[PDB]
């Protein structure tokens, strides 16, 4: 029997990947298409939440730096006003030995204690010499670190930090993923800086970036979904996929509505997708994949931005005097990520945990802190005591004075946080993905295609764009198969207005010869 609805291309999920698919679909305006999502609000893991007090929090804070001109076009289309954005320059430091070491760490050894600087340079020297002779390739992430950083920097930062964020040890991850993620320190550069006492903080695709004035990052994706025809969307309890029948190519929803498709773009976690397909083979395969969970903790504090905090953006915490691995001064991204000074709110408690001097509803201004803590089957965290643990950790790292007035807290656990680049991931994905494509299912996204190298808003978005382009125009999926290619170049060819539209438009008015 024929399904309730029938389209050429069905997109499941409405995070960056899903809307990516939809934008290109909408642009081509060829094949019939439909996008569904179990959430009444688009944006997925790039959404913003608001506290009863009025503090916005992303999912661990988010930064926008595009490798793609198409991604830029779409953003400009949803927020065209020039006061819809704020442009920032990256100010990132690392909390080490009681000091703020400018990011990247491996280029600012200069800031460390002399005693430690000697440890690090001794390692880079040993490392640099072996590299001058090596011909083989690093097997594990750990081997990589040791070869590029030396044992010194590895024990002082790399190792302990990488466990803190990945929730797994360095020896158990691959190293084919760290192209533009982990900087390989140059011996000449590093020493020079140690001598002169200068800093190197320009490295990375993070240098400069822009943030949305209003709504957090989630505001972006709401604005993006608004440019799509509503009738082709279906968001909420009515859009939740409960069953996927690959063989007869139909999708059942929560309210039992069935959708027929020729091509499926699926952005949901691939392990859930396997369940929905009731496919025992793919189920075995997807459970070879490993992932960590993410707690996001938000704290709202009264008072003008402290001078010790300054223009700091996101900070790193390798040391063990706090659960979180990274921290963001979310209040610096936009003056609308917390209430205005006039808004009155009662202090809930002080930073040390003691009750506040006065519980009356006082005025701001306020500022905001965002923290991320990882959790996995190798690194457990107590969910009930983590919120306190973080505020304690904020004191231990001198992020907060014991006397600082806390006027808002935020805690949420995202079961699927990071797609872990383990040593088995590829062996498992090179099976899963092609098999799904043989069924005409393009499984894409942070958890759709499970590749951290290219997990990220712009990447995820383009994953959805290129899947549609592959399906329709025979494009090559560069971003999915060749991360180091799309990452090392300016991707400017594909625009929100290509020839195909400019041409059909002059064929409308037309005539002339």
Ligand X SMILES: O=c1ccn([C@@H]2O[C@H](COP(=O)(O)OP(=O)(O)O)[C@@H](O)[C@H]2O)c(=O)[nH]1
Which residues would be at the binding site for a second copy (CB under 8 A)? 2-6, 8, 28, 30-32, 70, 132-133, 135, 262-263, 469-478, 485, 491, 493-495, 498-500, 503-504, 506-507, 512-513
Among 228, 233, 264, which residue's Cα sits nearest to residue 468?
264
For residue 513, the partner it binds in ligand X, ligand FDA, a second copy, none, with Cβ less than 5 to 8 A by kind, is a second copy
Rounded least distance, CB 314 to ligand X, Å: 7
For residue 94, the partner it binds in ligand X, a second copy, ligand FDA, none, with Cβ less than 5 to 8 A by kind, is ligand X
The string of DSSP codes covering 90-123 is ---EEEETTEEEESSGGG-GGGS-HHHHHHHHHH
For residue 457, the partner it binds in ligand FDA, a second copy, ligand X, none, with Cβ less than 5 to 8 A by kind, is ligand FDA
CA angle 230, 231, 235 (to 5 degrees): 65
For residue 200, the partner it binds in ligand X, ligand FDA, a second copy, none, with Cβ less than 5 to 8 A by kind, is none
CA distances from 136 to 41, 144, 150 (A): 49, 11, 17
Site mask for ligand FDA (CB under 6 A), range 368-387, x = bound: ----x---------------
Rounded least distance, CB 487 to ligand FDA, Å: 13
Residue pointed to by tokens 């063990």: 320
- How far is Cα 15 from Cα 41, in angstroms, rounded to an integer? 9
Q: Which of 387, 472 has the CB closer to a second copy?
A: 472
Q: How many CB atoms lie within 10 A of CB 441?
A: 22
CA distances from 105 to 125, 128, 139, 156, 358 (A): 17, 17, 23, 10, 41
Rounded least distance, CB 92 to a second copy, Å: 31
- Region 187-246 residues binding ligand FDA, contact defined as CB under 6 A: 239-241
Q: Which of 61, 364 has the CB closer to ligand FDA?
A: 61
Say how many residues make up the chain: 513
Rounded least distance, CB 63 to a second copy, Å: 25
Is residue 339 involved in binding ligand FDA (CB under 6 A)? no
Q: Give the DSSP H/E element, type plus range, for residue 361.
A: strand 361-363
- How far is Cα 192 from Cα 502, in angstroms, rounded to an integer? 53
Rounded least distance, CB 31 to a second copy, Å: 4
- How far is Cα 468 from Cα 263, in angstroms, rounded to an integer? 9
- How far is Cα 107 from Cα 116, in angstroms, rounded to an integer? 14
Q: What is the contact surface with ligand X in residues (CB under 6 A)?
A: 94, 103-105, 162, 165, 181-183, 316
Chain contacts with ligand FDA (rule: CB under 6 A): 12-18, 36-39, 44-46, 59-60, 62-63, 239-241, 267-268, 294, 372, 417, 445-448, 455-458, 460
């Amino acid at each position: 029997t024929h399904p309730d609805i029938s389209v050429d291309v069905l997109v499941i999920g409405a995070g960056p990947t899903g809307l990516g698919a939809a934008k290109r679909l909408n642009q081509i305006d060829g094949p019939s298409w439909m996008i569904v999502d179990s959430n009444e609000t688009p944006g997925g893991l790039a959404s913003t939440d608001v506290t009863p007090e009025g503090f916005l929090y992303d999912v661990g804070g988010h930064v926008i730096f595009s490798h793609y001109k198409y991604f830029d076009d779409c953003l400009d289309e949803a927020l065209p006003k020039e006061d819809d954005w704020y442009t920032h320059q990256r100010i990132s430091y690392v909390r080490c030995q009681g000091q703020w070491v400018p990011y990247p760490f491996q280029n600012n050894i200069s800031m460390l204690p002399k005693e430690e600087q000697v440890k690090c340079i001794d390692g880079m020297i040993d490392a640099a010499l072996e590299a001058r002779v090596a011909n083989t390739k690093p097997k594990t992430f750990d081997e990589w670190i040791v070869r590029m950083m030396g044992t010194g920097i590895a024990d002082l930062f790399m190792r302990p930090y990488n466990f803190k964020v990945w929730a797994v040890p360095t020896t158990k991850m691959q190293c084919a993923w760290l192209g533009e993620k982990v900087a390989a320190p140059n011996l000449k550069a590093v020493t020079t800086n140690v001598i002169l006492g200068k800093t190197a903080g320009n490295w990375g695709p993070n240098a400069t970036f822009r943030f949305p004035a209003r709504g957090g990052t989630g505001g972006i994706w709401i604005a993006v979904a608004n440019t799509l025809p509503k009738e082709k969307t279906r968001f909420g309890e009515k859009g939740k996929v409960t069953k996927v029948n690959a063989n007869n190519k139909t999708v059942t929803l929560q309210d039992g509505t069935t959708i027929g498709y020729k091509k499926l773009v699926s952005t949901m976690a691939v392990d859930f997708l396997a369940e929905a397909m009731n496919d025992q083979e793919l189920v075995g395969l997807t459970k070879q994949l490993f992932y960590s969970s993410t707690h996001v903790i938000g704290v709202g504090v009264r008072g003008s931005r402290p001078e010790r905090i300054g223009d700091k953006c996101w900070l790193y915490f390798p040391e063990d005097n706090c659960p979180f691995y990274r921290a963001t001064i979310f209040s610096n991204y936009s003056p609308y990520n917390q209430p205005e000074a006039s808004k009155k709110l009662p202090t809930m408690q002080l930073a040390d945990g003691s009750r506040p001097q006065s519980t009356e509803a006082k005025e701001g201004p306020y500022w905001s802190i965002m923290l991320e803590v990882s959790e996995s089957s190798m690194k457990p965290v107590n969910q009930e005591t983590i919120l306190a643990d973080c505020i304690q950790g904020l004191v231990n790292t001198e992020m907060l004075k014991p006397t600082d007035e806390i006027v808002s807290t935020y805690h949420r656990r995202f079961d699927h946080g990071y797609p872990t680049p383990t040593l088995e991931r590829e062996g498992a994905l090179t099976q899963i993905l092609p098999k799904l494509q043989d069924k005409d299912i393009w499984s894409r996204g942070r958890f759709g295609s499970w590749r951290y190298e290219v997990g990220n808003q712009d990447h995820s978005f383009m994953l959805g764009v290129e899947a549609v382009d592959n399906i329709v125009n025979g494009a090559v999926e560069l971003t999915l198969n060749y991360p180091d290619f799309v990452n090392g170049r300016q991707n400017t060819e594909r625009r929100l207005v290509d020839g195909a539209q400019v041409f059909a438009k002059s064929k409308a008015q037309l005539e002339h010869h």
